[PDB]
Amino acid sequence: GAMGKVTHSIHIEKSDTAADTYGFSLSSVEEDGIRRLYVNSVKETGLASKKGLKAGDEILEINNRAADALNSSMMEDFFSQPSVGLLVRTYPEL
């Protein structure tokens, strides 16, 4: 069961998808005064789902950069590219 968090990394490519979309969203939030990035809106049978992303997973890094060191200019540049790497932190689904 869910006790400690688990951290894992994935590398995803648009050429492995049907329609050049990974099938998830990233939520930029302020949570108790702290800026965080979360996985959200994971499409069933989409690439992100295949790679084991879950809504609510915290994104710790994108392309080897800490989430709290990103800005919107970097975000847009990163997700304009044909591929992207993520470090995420999750709980077991159950």
């Binding site: 979309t21 990974y22 990233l26 939520s27 939030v29 302020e30 959200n40 809106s41 919107s72």
Partner: peptide, 8 residues
């Protein structure tokens, strides 16, 4: 408090 959603 969500201030942006990126759909990728």
């Amino acid at each position: 408090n969500k201030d942006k959603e990126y759909y990728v």
